[PDB]
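Lab meeting, action items carried over

1. Structure of the seven-component assembly. Owner: GW. Status: complete.
Input record:
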Amino acid sequence: NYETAVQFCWNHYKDQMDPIEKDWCDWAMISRPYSTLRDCLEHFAELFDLGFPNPLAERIIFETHQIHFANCSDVLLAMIIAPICLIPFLITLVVWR
Amino acid sequence: CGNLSTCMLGTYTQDFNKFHTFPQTAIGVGAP
Amino acid sequence: KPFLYVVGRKKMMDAQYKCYDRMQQLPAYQGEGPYCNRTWDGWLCWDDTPAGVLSYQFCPDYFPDFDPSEKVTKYCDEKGVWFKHPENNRTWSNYTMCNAFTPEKLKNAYVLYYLAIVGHSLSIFTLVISLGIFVFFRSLGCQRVTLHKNMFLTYILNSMIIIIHLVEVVPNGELVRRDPVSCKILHFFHQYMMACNYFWMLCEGIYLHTLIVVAVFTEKQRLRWYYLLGWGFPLVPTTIHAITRAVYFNDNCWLSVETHLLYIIHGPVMAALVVNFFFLLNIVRVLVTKMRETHEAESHMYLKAVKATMILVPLLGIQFVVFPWRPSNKMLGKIYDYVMHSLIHFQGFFVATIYCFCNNEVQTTVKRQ
Amino acid sequence: QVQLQESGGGLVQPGGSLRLSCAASGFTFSNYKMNWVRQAPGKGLEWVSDISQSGASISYTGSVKGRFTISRDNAKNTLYLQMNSLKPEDTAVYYCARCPAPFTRDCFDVTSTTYAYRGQGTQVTVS
Amino acid sequence: DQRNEEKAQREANKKIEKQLQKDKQVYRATHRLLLLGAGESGKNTIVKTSGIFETKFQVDKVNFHMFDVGAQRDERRKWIQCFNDVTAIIFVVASSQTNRLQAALKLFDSIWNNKWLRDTSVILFLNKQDLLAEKVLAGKSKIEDYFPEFARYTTPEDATPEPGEDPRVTRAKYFIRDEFLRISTASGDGRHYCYPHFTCSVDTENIRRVFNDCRDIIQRMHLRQYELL
Amino acid sequence: SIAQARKLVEQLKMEANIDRIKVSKAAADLMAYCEAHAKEDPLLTPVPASENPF
Amino acid sequence: SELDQLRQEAEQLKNQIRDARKACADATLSQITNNIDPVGRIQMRTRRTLRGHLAKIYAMHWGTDSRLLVSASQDGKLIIWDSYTTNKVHAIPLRSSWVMTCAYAPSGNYVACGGLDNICSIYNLKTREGNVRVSRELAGHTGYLSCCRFLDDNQIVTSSGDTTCALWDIETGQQTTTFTGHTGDVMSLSLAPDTRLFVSGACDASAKLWDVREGMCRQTFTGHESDINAICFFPNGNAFATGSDDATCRLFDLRADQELMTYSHDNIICGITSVSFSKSGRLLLAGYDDFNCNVWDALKADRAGVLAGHDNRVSCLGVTDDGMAVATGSWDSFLKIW
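Predicted assembly:
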């Protein structure tokens, strides 16, 4: 049943944490390794009526946030203001050579 | 942008398009 | 998975980590007996709340069919647990109010869809006649009129791509779900002609400012720059936005506007309409001055100063500087969306009926021939 | 043949009265404006008074305003200048000049040194 | 072959059209004026043989083309129609024998009401202002017997007095202006305008008054194109 | 002056003995000239495209 | 003294000359000419358009070959058009930009132009070098030039605003005959088919008739009531039409000494600026000031056509020597070949 699926990817997530180990309490480098954890819980438990907030899954995701975060817990506007800045150089050019 | 007079046609082009191409989700029924 | 659903799950995981981390640092609190503890339903986390205290929270913008305007109605009874829906008999949260307004807004938005077509249908039928007169009658041909031909040529082509876009990409679910190259190319032409249309309102404003206010004697200036600022200049912001859109935020047919890359197009445009607004407070400043020297009556200098303002607004496109934003309320947006779509969609008609039909120099020329 | 003949004249004392009847034969008297020009002895032709097409406007110069009165009879084509309370400086010929072109509010070259649509004049001298 | 002479004409129609295009720019870059000053009124020195005495002078890179019409006959109704395309008509009036002012008042009325000159603005130059200050101050007051409405006349509230002038002359100078500004307002329609000015024929800035007045005519002409004014 | 008033009489005198004929004889040539050259008048009747330069 | 006596003989001579005209006024072409065939509405359309001029066109004249056409404008240009293919054969830059007349030599070698400069300049087209230059600078007049016409390659008849017509000699540059007798400014002239007589309508409402051999004034007509602005000879040489500023046209005659017909409409109030006849003298295209070329009829006196393809007033009008085209100029620089 579902219990065979929770412990399946529970230790699998630990295998993906090794490259980013000792640096898990930041927000940037946890984008990909964290999003793939829920897909296991969602896909295997879709048959059951408890969804993602599964009592079994609720603890394993709450405990996951305890083994890791217990001790620790410009290029966009450049292409925007440059074309606007180049307009008055042309608005002055048309009125005065 | 969004809520800007110049892209009002684009903002409309998105909200009107979301009804046809994106199905409605379950509002609490069989879900969170 | 669609791009909006991809960025919805990507944003949903940011709240799941933030909420579970917030439940760790925040300590517990003792309420009035059995109370409503903190639970994560799946979309928003709720904090510890005493029994009998309902919590209204804005629904998330994860899904495309969800608007953050409405709120939720999550409730917990006195026994000490959250509300259980009678059907599933499990924990429940009321997200109905978020999407309940979608059917009513569907019919209200459909009215604007037909307004954008009938409004753009007169921008072509009443403009080919307005353009077919200047090209037929060359006696009226002046530097003001040759700029009208380009001013009309961008009003026409912009109103043809929008009509094609509104009837091909917008109401077809298959085209957006299965993203083809054709729609993205059409969006590139739609964003180029729209920027070219909003840029020829500046060229027609600069020439008006360079003919009345400044440099009245030096006339017959070369049109090498007017033909470049209008038709060739919009190629710079549209191509830069196009290459960035394809590498950073590639939405389904680019119809989505929830990106800051659109400011590359709506920024130089919003920087040109303000110049036209600054070129409108300078034309009226002279027109009022040219009526005070005649020493007329004060009750007549204003009757003509409003007639000249309400005719340069369609030409210079002065409707985005007096309404540079949309209000957050709903009692104003119901009229704002109706008063802004009437000036934009019917702009090609209001221009063709003032400077071509209501022009005294045309009313006497055609009546003679 | 634009022919403008006048009448009246003779010697009158200062403060008397005279009626200068100006005949007009050869053109439509209504379609054209009328003028009165006098020539002082050894001086240039000056404009005295004009009348509109049909009694609309009756303008005078400075000296004859209130003293003289110009009127026209379109049924008789006779232009009149009812003079009253004359002054010893009014001793001058009185030509009956006609405006050059019809149905216009402009009149040009009526006081010119030589003009074609003018009369012979009457020696209106004051004793 | 019989079509080889065609390109010889199309090349003749090319250089000529190239000359007809470089001449179109220098023609519309020069504003043609008309000096129609009264006789013995300093019309020649109002800005300072042949049928027309041209006068080329520039004001801030704007070359004006004034045409002093001399050696012509008395009748002007026929030849005044050729000056309908000019920018303005410099009208010089002698403010001081026979009646000099009435000779210039009836002439201005004819130009104002001329069908061809209803779209041509007129610039008024009331000359001989220095001599005006001497006739009214002392001597024969010829402005009172040549005009019966001057005795019961008061200077308007819009009068700008100048230093060294008699108040009786200011009431007389502005009276002649109101006599010219009565025909330009009643019989007017709104196409052409009249700009009165005061000059003594010795002003060293008469080219500035015509320059500013011509800039107001082109602006009012451009305002008429866009149906603004 | 008086010397110019004589010029009007000395000129009008010779213009009185000029030969004159009735309108029925002087205007009858116009009716004959118009009818004679009516065939060669392109303004009266339109000519085909192969007969006019335009 | 003799001043009153001079008027007694003048009034009697004016009455003796008036009674003689009444005796020859049996029908005045009003009762017998009514039984003719009217050509009806003759509709014409513009076939060409010359838009090369910058200022208002004031005059034009066709050549003997009926192909070339010289036009004078108020910008200082004397462009010689080719009416067949619309080609600017020549573009003569004139000294004075005030041009009021122009003419084409009967041989096509010379071209003249007058204006407010009182000078009638002669330009040589057929030059050995290949360029264009002024050949003669005729001076002497005291008024603006109204119309100029060429008798031959060495003679030219002019008419100025100084109430006098002249006859110049291009070989030497001095005039040989000074026609005098008009009271108002002569506005136009037209040579007869035989270059011996020519009429000249003046501002004094009098149209005279001169003889190029002497300074003699043959006849004088005073039918009109305002300034005569246009004149043109009949193709037969025994009649001429006159347009005036009183919105009427009158066809005079030489053998009758009086006007025959008087073309006038109740609606027209604008003066006539240019008139000319057709090849057969059947049409009288008068150029009115209402931007329309009302095509009258010399016989029926009925308006049988109107040409309204003009923005501004029609300042000049010239029919071809063969009757194929009717070129009308106007103040909007558009010379349309009808």
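2. GW to write a short summary for the group page. Key points so far: The first strand of chain G starts at residue 48 and ends at 50. The helical segments of chain G are 2-23.
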